[PDB]
């Protein structure tokens, strides 16, 4: 739940996000900044150095997948649980990703937005996206709860 000014800011800035190098930059930085997340992607090959991760095609392609889900959820703001239900049980039941890593990826995404948009990603715009990423992270952790 958020104000229409937040709804406008979150959608206007997401319209500038292309196509996507942001998805790969976020998944990449999660594997770099928090290396324990690499275990879930052991079949992606080399992830030994930050460059190996950023230059990984399997990471880049999977990056496109994760950011695509965010875009889907950004339309279905009012119902985040039903939208991410088909993905919550995946990560929960047998993939076994600790729900803290959901909040880490959300925050890393927010860092990528600040990196790519700069001064455009103003503090009230960050605040709006925070409510969104907390939402997505909670929606992807409903199956554990």
């Amino acid at each position: 739940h958020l104000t229409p000014e937040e709804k406008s800011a979150v959608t206007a800035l997401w319209g500038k996000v292309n196509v996507d190098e942001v998805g790969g930059e976020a998944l990449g930085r999660l594997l770099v900044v928090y290396p324990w997340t690499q275990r879930f992607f052991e079949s992606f090959g080399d992830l030994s150095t930050p460059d190996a991760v950023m230059g990984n095609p399997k990471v880049k392609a999977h990056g496109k997948k994760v950011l695509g889900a965010f875009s889907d959820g950004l339309a279905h703001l009012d119902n985040l649980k039903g939208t991410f239900a088909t993905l919550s049980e995946l990560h929960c039941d047998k993939l076994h990703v600790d729900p803290e890593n959901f909040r880490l990826l959300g925050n890393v995404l927010v860092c990528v937005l600040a990196h790519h948009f700069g001064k455009e990603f103003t503090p009230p715009v960050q605040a709006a996206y925070q409510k969104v990423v907390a939402g997505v992270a909670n929606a992807l952790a409903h199956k554990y709860h």
Binding site: E25, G28, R29, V32, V33, P50, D51, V53, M54, V110, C111, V112, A114, H115, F117, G118, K119, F121, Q126
Partner: peptide, 18 residues
């Protein structure tokens, strides 16, 4: 981290960020 990324893009590399 968000502030650093916003003002210093060339500096905020995945390795520096980490």
């Amino acid at each position: 981290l968000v502030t650093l990324a916003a003002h210093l893009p060339a500096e905020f590399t995945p390795a520096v960020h980490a």
